[PDB]
Design a protein around this ligand. Structure first.
Ligand SMILES: O=S(=O)(O)c1cc(S(=O)(=O)O)c2ccc3c(S(=O)(=O)O)cc(S(=O)(=O)O)c4ccc1c2c43
Ligand SMILES: O=S(=O)(O)c1cc(S(=O)(=O)O)c2ccc3c(S(=O)(=O)O)cc(S(=O)(=O)O)c4ccc1c2c43
Ligand SMILES: [K+]
Ligand SMILES: [K+]
Ligand SMILES: [K+]
Ligand SMILES: [K+]
Ligand SMILES: [K+]
Ligand SMILES: [K+]
Ligand SMILES: [K+]
Ligand SMILES: [K+]
Lengths: 493, 405, 405, 493
C-alpha cells in the first residue's frame, strides 16, 4: 500500500512478470491490412484492431474486417474489432489559388456566410460552423490547421462575420480544420457520415465504437440511438478531445462503456502539461468506475519511420501503465509505419517492464477504500475475491462471466495475478480485449452443455492457467462464478 | 491518502499552486555565460548554475563563476554554483569497470572548485561507496562543507545505490548515460527506484539528461518530453536539469520558463501527503528527537492547515529534514550562512532567507530570525493575518504553531 | 473501529439485539434435577447442563443425564451435557504442584461419561499441556469426539496457558479457584488475558465461579455482580456459568433469566467489529484457504450489512471458525450430526439446525441444507425478503452472498 | 491499537507501573475527620476530600475544611476539597403512628394536597412534588424508599390525587424519598438549602462542586449563577442520577467541568445492567470531551465493615479504570467505615493493577481519530506532544499550565508516561487532582520570577520527574508550554 514503498524493494535486474496485463490497440492501414501482416501483428502483441473512419471507404474497411477475422481463426485467437468514427468537424472553406498567406499583425475576417465557401482569400474566408458568431466572444481564439494558425477575435462585425487579428505568421490551404479552445461547441454527437458508418459497423458486427469528439453525457446516448436495436451490445468508448469532455467526464463515464484519452486532440486546445494531468484524472476516474480506459495518440510516433523510439516516448508509454491504463494505442505506427511488428513488440516490452515495477495492491486498496458501504453483492464478491488472492498468495483467478460484467468488475480491483475468464459468448471474449489483466476462454454451451453445476467451465479455466504455466499442483486459484455472486478458493491438482 | 483518490478530486481549470517546489538546474555555456543572459535565466527560474568541466578551461569557468555571482547580486537573490566533473573515460555493459574514481584532471578541477568556493560537486561515473571517499579526500579539508552529489551512469551505480546514497550528499539520475548499456524501459524504472530511495534517505535527487532536448533548437518541445518532466516531478524529484538547452541552446529563457510551468502544473496534481505518510510509516520506532520533531511539524501542517513553515537552520540539515516529509505548503528557511541559502537550492519546497548574525545579533531567544521568516512568508503572500505558521527551530528540537498577526 | 468510539454512538433506550450470542451454562443439582425444573432452565436460557462430579453418585448423575435428554426432547431443542471432574486434591501458592493429572476416580468417571455419551469434559486443575493428553487417553478411542475443556485453577495453568490452549478444545476461567493463591485484582486481568487468547485461538472460553452468587438465596444480585457478568461478555467470553445458583439455589429460573438479560444488554453495547478487526490483523499472510474463507465471509457481512450467516459444517469446526471472527449478526449452523448441535452450545453467536441425512438425502449439491438454514433464519425473524445472507460451506471452502426470497 | 491485542502480550507476574494514573476521592465522615485520620488517608491514596451536604452542619464541614488543609500542609501536599450538594428531592409526608403497611394488590391514593402532609395513612398520603399530577401518566410507576415500594398509577382521581395499585408488600415510614422512573422531573437545579451551602463553599474556597441531580444543560448554568462572581473558577462536576441526565449528557458535558456517574442513584430508576452500559457511554464521552469523569457509589461497599471486599467489587473497580475513568469514589467506606486507610490502599492497588493491563495507545488513537480537521492549535500541539511520547518512547511529560486547561488537554490523549504539570496557581494544583495521570508542581511566580523564558519552570518539572524516578540521564522528556502552543523533546541530563 504505497508505490513509493514498493519502489524501494525493486531491482531492475529481477525477471519480469509471467504475464502482460496491459492491452495493445493497433490501427490497421496500408502497412498492415494483409493477412500475414496481421498474423505478425497479433503474434507481436495486438489485442484490438482499430479501423479509422476518418479515411478509407466501406470496401477498404470491409477487407480489414475480413482479414482480421481470418488471421484470428488461423492462430486460434479472438481479436476485437473497433470502429473509430470520423466525428463532427469545423473546417475552413476553399481559397483562391489554394493558399492564404497570414502575416502577423494583419487583420482578417471570418464569416459563416456560405457564399464565401468557394472563394476565400487572406482577408476574408469561410468557417462551416453556423453557430460561430454566438459561441465566440471577443478576446477568444480561433485555431486553424492543427492549431498552427492562431487568430484572436477583436469584434463582431455583423451577424455572421468576425473581425480577427493574425497573432502569428503561417500559410493555410483548402478546408483546414479549426478548433475553438475555451468555447462550447454544440455540434451534434454524430455526423451524417457517422450515421452511415455506424450502421455498417453494426451490420458487420464490430465489437466496439471509439466515438469521436464526445462533449456531454447526452451525446453518449445519441451514438447508442444511432447503433439501433441490433447493436445494443456494442461497447461505446468515448473519445475525450476538448475541455467539454474533460469538464463533463463524470457523467460521460457513467453513460459510456469506456474512455479514450486522445492526448493529441486534447493538446491542440489545452496546454500539453495540463493534458498530462488530464490523463492522470481520466484514467483514475475510469479505474474507480470499472470501465476500460485507453491511452491513445502520440505513443511511439518516432518509430513510425525510425527503428527505435526516443527515450521520452518509452517513458510516456510506461507512465501510461503507471497511471493505470487498461490499453495503450498505436495510430500511424502500425497503419502507415515502417516497423509494424517491431513497434508492437517494444510497446509490449515497455508495458511488461512498467507492470513489473507497478504495485497492484495500491490500486486494490485505493479503489476498495472508496466503495460506499453497504456494498452491493456483486461488488462485495469481486473485491473479496481479489482480497483472497492477496490473502492467500494465489497464482490465478477464474471468473465465469457471460457478458463480461463480473470479469471487468474483478479486473477493477487489480489482483497481482492473471485473471482467466470463462464465457459462453465469443463477443465477450473479444470485447474483454480492452480490459487489462484478463484473458478469455470460450466455452461452447450449445455444444458441451448448460453446465449448471459450473464444474466443466471452472475446469476449462484452470486448465488454461496450467497451460500458460500460471498454476500447478499445490497452488491456490480463486474461482468466482454465478451476475456472479459465489467464490471458492480452489486447490489446484 | 493515495495518488489515485487525489486524482479524482482534481480539475485542470483550477488555479495552480502559489509556489513552485521543484528546483531547476541550468548548465552554463556560450549562449548563457554573460551576466545579462544569467539574469534572464534567474528570472526564468534558474536555482542552480551548472558548469560542465568536460569542456572549457579554468579561465572560462572562472567567467561563469564571476558572472553568476554578479547576476545574482544585482537581482538580490542567492544562486548555487555546481561543478560537474569530466570523470574517468566506449562502454562495457555486463562488465564491472574498475577505472579510478577521479581522474588527474578531476583532482585538479576539484581543487579549483574549492579555491573558487563552489557549493556542490556533481561527481561523474560513481560506481561504489569508496569512490565517494575519493571525491571527499580530493576536495581536502578546506572544502569539507561542499556537497558531493553522485552521478549514476552505469549498472554498478544502480546495484550499489544504497551504499552510494549513504556516503553521498545526494544523487543525480543521468538517464542518457544509463541508456547506453541499460534498456530505456529499465532506466524509467531505475529512475523511480533511485528517486524514491533518495526521498526516504532525505537526500536531494536530480533528474538529469534528455529533459527537453528538442527545445535546444525548436521553440517548443515534443509532447512526450513534457510528460517526462511532469513524471519526473511525480516520481519525487527535488530537481530537474537542463544541459544543452541552456548551454548551447537557442531559447535559453523559454525552455527554463516552460520547465518551471510544467513543474508547477505537475505539483498542482501531486499529492504531498502520500510522500509524508509513506516516509513516516517507514521510520523505526523509537525515533530520534530531531526526526520526530520534523515529522510532527509537517503533520501539524496537515492537521491545522498551516499555510507556511519557518525552519531555523544554520547548516540546512533540518531544512532538508523537514522538506523530506513533504508538507503541502512552502518551507521558509532562516539561516545565518549564505552558503546554506545556495546549497538549499537543490532541495524542493524550501526558500531561504539570509539573516546577518554579524551585523544584527546572535538572536539567542531566536525571535528576530523567526519574525524575519514570517515577514518573508507574508511578503510572498503565503500567509496573512489569521493563518497558522509552523515554526521549527533549536538538531532543531523545538516546535511552535504560531498565529500570524 | 474501537469500543470507545462505539460507546459514543449508543443509547440505553434503544431496543436490544434480536438475538443473544453469549451462552449460559447451568449446574444441575437437587433443586433442578427434575424434568420440569430442567424445562424451566431451558426456557430460561440454559444451553449447557453441567454435572459436578465432586459430589453425587453415578446413579445420581445418570438421572441428570436422562432427565436433560427427556426435557430437551419435549421442548424440541438440543442441550449439551457437561461432565466436570472432581480432580486431584489445602493449596500451595508459589509452589508447583505435581499431583497426577487425573485421579483414579476421574478415570472411572470419565469412562462413565463416554458410556453415557457426554458432549464435553470440564477437566479440573489443569497445570500443563501433557495433562491434557492424560485426559485424552483416559477417555479412550470411543470418546475421541468429546471436547476437553480445561479448568485454569492455579498459577501453573496461567503460566503455561499457551500450550494448554493448543492441546485443549477450550478453557474455563475459574475465578474463585484462582483467587485462593492469586490476588483478586490479578485474577480480573488473568481473565482478560485468558479470554482474549481463546478468541484468537478460536476456542470456546467459559467465565465461571462467583458469577451471581448472591442470587442463590436472594431474589436479586448485587449491582457489582451484574457488572461482573456484563464485563465477562465485554471481555469476549463465549459462555457464562452458574454453579450453586441453579444447583442448590432458591431461584433457579430467575437467575438464568437475569443472566440472559445482562448478556443481551452487554452484547447490545459490544462492538463486534473490534473483535473481527483485531483477530484479522493478527493472522499470518499467506493465510490458509479455510481461514481466509471464514474471515472473508464475516467481512462480507459487515460490507453488505447481511442480517444472517448460514454455515454448513458436520463437525462444527467451520461454525466455530466463523464465530471466531465475530459478525454483528446471527450465525446459523446446518449440521448432519446431533452431537455438533449440542457441542456448539459453548460457542457464541451460533444456533444449530439439525439436518437428517439418513432420512432425507446426502444433499451433494447442498441446496436442501442451505435452504433449511435460511428458513430457520426466516423463522426467527433474522432475515426477510430483500435481505442478504452469507452462506459458507464445502474445510468449508465456498462462499455465497445470497438474496433472501 | 487494540486492547484485545494488548491482552495477548500481558503477564500477571510482570511488575506493575511506576506510577498510578487514576485518582481517589474519599468521603470524610465520623471515621476520618480528625487530622491524623486524614494524614493516614492521604498517605493511603486520597487526592480529593468529598464533603456530603446531605448530612452535617456548616460548623461540622468547617472542621473538615480546616483539618484537610492542615493535613495537606503537614505532608507537603495539595489536596482538593469537594462540596457535594444535597440537591432537590421528592419525598412522602408523615404518617400516623410512623408506619404505613403497604400490602400487595391493595389500592392507595397519593396526593399533592399539603393538608395531608402531617396526617398520612396507608390509604392516602402526601408527596411534596406539586407537579406530580401533570408529570405522571396512568401506567407509570412511583418508587418510594430507595425504590423498594413500587406503586403503579391507575388513574387521575382529581386535580391533585392519583389512584394507585400496590405492586409489592413493604412497610414505609416518615418522609421517605420517592423516584419517578421514566418521568421528566422539572424541579429547580438547586434547592433553597443548596443556595446557602454553595455560598458557604465559595466563602471557604472549595475547589469543586459535585452538583446533584443534574437533568439538563440549562441547570449547569444555574449552579454557576448560584456560585456568584467570586466562584467562577470553581469546577462544576455534574452528577447524572436519572434518565434525563443520561438523555441530555452531550449538552451537559459541554456546559459542565466534568461528570459523576452515580450508579447507585441511577440504579434506583434504571435496571442495573443498563446502568453498566450508561457508565461505558458517559465515561467514553467525557474522555473525548477532555473533561474529568468520576465513577462513584457502590465501589467497595462490603469493605465498610469487612476487612476485605467481594471479588465482584474488585472487578467493578478495575473495570471503572478500564472504562476510562479519571476518578474512583468512596462514600461510606471512608466516611462511616471501619477500614478507612485499608479501603483506599486496596482501591489504589486495584487501579494500579488495572492500569498495568490497560493499553493507553487505544485511548490515544481513538480520541485522535475522532478530532475534526482542521484542528485548532491547542488541540494540535497537545495531541502531537503525546504522539511524540509514543514516537520516541519518552518517559515523562512536562506541561506548563496556569489554569490547568492544557494539562487536562494533554491528559486526554493518554500518554503511557506520567504528566508533570508546572503551575503558578495552587487552586490549579488542587483542581487537577481529579484528572488522571497528572501530578502538579507549584511555582511561586511572585516569589521566584515571571519566568518569561520558561527555563525555571521546565527545570522544576524535570527535577520532580527525576525525584520520583521517572526519568534519568539519557531519557527523553516531552515539554509543552505557552494557552500552550509550544513543544520540545528534551534530553534529560
Ligand atoms: O440529418 S439527417 O441525415 O437528415 C438524419 C437522418 C437520420 S436517419 O434517417 O434515421 O438515418 C436520423 C436519424 C436519427 C436522428 C436522431 S435520433 O438519434 O434518431 O433521435 C437525431 C438527429 S439530430 O440531428 O440530433 O436532431 C438526427 C439528425 C439527422 C438525422 C437523423 C437524426
Ligand atoms: O427561592 S428563594 O429562596 O426565595 C431564592 C433566593 C435567591 S437569592 O436571594 O438570590 O439568594 C435566589 C437567587 C437567584 C435565583 C435564581 S437565579 O439563578 O439568580 O436566576 C433563580 C431562581 S429559580 O427558582 O430557578 O427561579 C431562584 C429561586 C429562588 C431564589 C433565588 C433564585
Ligand atoms: K478529431
Ligand atoms: K507488479
Ligand atoms: K559522462
Ligand atoms: K499539490
Ligand atoms: K476444584
Ligand atoms: K452489538
Ligand atoms: K440523591
Ligand atoms: K499500561
Amino acid at each position: 500500500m504505497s508505490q513509493l514503498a514498493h519502489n524501494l524493494t525493486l531491482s531492475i535486474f529481477d525477471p519480469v512478470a509471467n504475464y502482460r496485463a496491459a492491452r495493445i490497440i493497433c490501427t490497421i492501414g496500408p502497412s498492415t491490412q494483409s493477412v500475414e501482416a496481421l498474423k505478425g501483428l497479433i503474434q507481436s502483441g495486438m489485442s484490438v484492431a482499430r479501423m479509422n473512419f476518418s479515411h478509407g471507404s466501406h470496401e477498404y474497411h470491409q477487407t480489414t474486417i475480413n482479414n482480421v477475422r481470418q488471421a484470428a481463426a488461423e492462430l486460434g485467437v479472438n481479436i476485437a474489432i473497433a470502429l473509430d468514427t470520423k466525428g463532427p468537424e469545423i473546417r475552413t472553406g476553399q481559397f483562391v489559388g489554394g493558399d492564404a498567406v497570414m502575416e502577423r499583425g494583419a487583420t482578417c475576417y471570418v464569416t459563416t456566410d456560405p457564399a464565401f465557401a468557394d472563394k476565400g482569400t487572406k482577408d476574408k474566408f469561410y468557417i462551416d460552423y453556423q453557430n460561430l458568431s454566438k459561441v465566440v466572444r471577443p478576446g477568444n481564439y480561433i485555431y486553424i490547421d492543427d492549431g498552427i494558425l492562431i487568430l484572436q477575435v477583436q469584434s463582431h462585425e455583423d451577424e455572421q462575420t468576425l473581425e480577427c487579428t493574425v497573432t502569428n505568421s503561417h500559410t493555410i490551404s483548402d478546408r483546414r480544420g479549426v478548433n475553438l479552445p475555451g468555447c462550447d461547441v454544440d455540434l451534434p454527437a454524430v455526423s451524417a457520415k457517422d450515421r452511415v458508418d455506424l450502421q455498417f459497423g453494426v451490420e458487420q458486427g464490430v465489437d466496439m465504437i471509439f466515438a469521436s469528439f464526445i462533449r456531454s453525457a447526452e451525446q453518449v446516448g445519441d451514438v447508442r440511438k444511432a447503433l439501433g436495436p441490433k447493436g445494443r451490445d456494442i461497447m461505446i468508448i468515448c473519445k475525450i478531445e476538448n475541455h467539454q469532455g474533460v469538464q463533463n467526464i463524470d457523467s460521460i463515464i457513467e453513460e459510456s462503456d469506456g474512455i479514450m484519452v486522445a492526448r493529441g486532440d486534447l493538446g491542440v486546445e489545452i496546454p500539453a502539461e495540463k493534458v498530462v494531468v488530464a490523463q492522470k484524472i481520466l484514467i483514475s476516474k475510469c479505474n474507480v468506475a470499472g470501465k476500460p480506459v485507453i491511452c491513445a495518440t502520440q505513443m511511439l510516433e518516432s518509430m513510425t519511420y525510425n527503428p527505435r523510439p526516443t527515450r521520452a516516448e518509452v517513458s510516456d508509454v510506461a507512465n501510461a501503465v503507471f497511471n493505470g491504463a487498461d490499453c495503450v494505442m498505436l495510430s500511424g505506427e502500425t497503419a502507415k509505419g515502417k516497423y509494424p511488428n517491431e513497434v508492437v513488440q517494444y510497446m509490449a516490452r515497455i508495458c511488461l517492464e512498467a507492470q513489473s515495477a507497478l504495485n497492484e495492491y495500491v490500486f486494490f486498496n485505493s479503489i476498495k477504500k472508496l466503495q460506499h458501504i453497504p456494498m452491493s453483492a456483486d461488488e462485495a464478491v469481486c473485491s473479496s475475491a481479489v482480497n483472497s488472492v492477496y490473502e492467500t498468495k494465489a497464482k490465478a483467478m477464474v471468473v465465469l462471466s457471460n457478458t463480461g460484467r463480473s470479469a471487468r468488475l474483478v479486473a477493477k480491483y487489480r489482483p497481482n495475478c492473471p485473471i482467466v475468464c470463462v464465457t459462453t459468448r465469443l463477443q465477450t471474449c473479444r470485447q474483454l480485449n480492452i480490459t487489462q489483466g484478463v484473458e478469455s476462454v470460450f466455452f461452447d454451451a450449445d455444444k458441451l452443455g448448460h453446465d449448471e453445476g459450473k464444474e466443466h467451465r471452472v475446469a476449462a479455466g484452470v486448465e488454461f492457467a496450467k497451460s500458460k504455466g500460471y498454476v500447478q499442483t499445490g497452488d491456490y486459484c480463486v474461482v468466482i462464478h454465478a451476475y456472479a455472486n459465489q467464490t471458492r478458493i480452489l486447490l489446484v491438482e
